[PDB]
Amino acid sequence: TPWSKSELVRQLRDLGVRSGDMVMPHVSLRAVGPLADGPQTLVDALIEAVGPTGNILAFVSWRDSPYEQTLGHDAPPAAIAQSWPAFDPDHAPAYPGFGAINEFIRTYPGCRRSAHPDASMAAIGPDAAWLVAPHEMGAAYGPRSPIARFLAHAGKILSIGAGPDAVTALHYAEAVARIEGKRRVTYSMPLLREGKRVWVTTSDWDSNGILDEYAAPDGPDAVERIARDYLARTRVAQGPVGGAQSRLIDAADIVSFGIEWLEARHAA
Template structure:
């Protein structure tokens, strides 16, 4: 079955239908492939989202960094002096987003009014009236903690919009991992390259292990984020709709994180 490319007006209507409102603060996860053809491409989708949110709304996205040093320096892994000297420095005003989190994020990061947080790996990009507030003072010692951009999105209170993206991409649930009261949570340490007072510096970052919060998760490849998100949807929480060909969900961020904390504590607390 053939579909005509979506135009901006159709996208605006479908975003309204799913429950997105002017003035919302929303974190967006996007699969362009799931949505299908858009006239004008991803820029049209971004324009439609910003039109719906209006002058008092804010759009946020988890973008990370294409040249993340996480894997190369994780938990004591070392780089040679030459590798350290050649590794690109993280500059939030120009850093390319990580390709693994969606092509749409490139358009978010190129927007002339975008603000980005100073954490290379947990980097958040935001556009709108609260963008500067959301992205300020992003500590290297807790990328996903209550004081991080994720914590501010939840506290706002904000919403999370899944435009065809899979359940495992719900980044806001990293906050649930950070605050859930369960024993034995794993922490990881790694180094990040920054420009500080005009000098190249490597600084240590530290956070709960978002890829394997407990040892038993690492042993069997368990994805707690995807499991929490799946159970949340099965309880018919949030609003469901379609944008283009994609099945989409709009969630209340506070309710989602509260559910995630309870889910983790019931099973592992």
């Protein structure tokens, strides 16, 4: 029988979500199973669990981000440049591969959305505006990004049936790790500035593998390796949300662990 909002809220409380919390979810809706009113039921449950003083931050990205189409070029290729839609945060759908729940999060009334078209983050709650801006090209997941502020805001990572590769906040550890050989990428995004499309080309850390040995197309990347080690080494609340095995992780702790993990393995 499909899970009700009330059942999910009680499960989230059992896992350790408290009123006032700052939560970043990563969700496998297949693992959760049928919901009374579809994915919105779980969105509503998350909002209720964090309460009117809590916040939700999600890495939603953009369905039509021209990442692969501009990757490695010093400017967008001509055909891309002429016709690609500018990123419009009010209308641009979420990237389906990071979870079908994210389109429901980003369309929730009052949700705020960050300006980085490829790394776009959505936030709900009183601190949403502070979470989502600034989010500049060249600062996808590291210092000055919404992830940085999430880590300073007592953030908890709520993994609902998601794998250890799903932990976006660990890209902050990659960004700041004092290690040799870090990979960078160059890509271009079409932004709206005063109503006009402006192409911006930037470089940033490679979020598909910070070192060559972590950059196989189907990983494991460093995020996955760090998170697997961390979860083998740390007490973390575990329990069901819907039908999904779930975990509630202290974000600052896992990121600090990840910085140490990288720096212990790779020369400066």
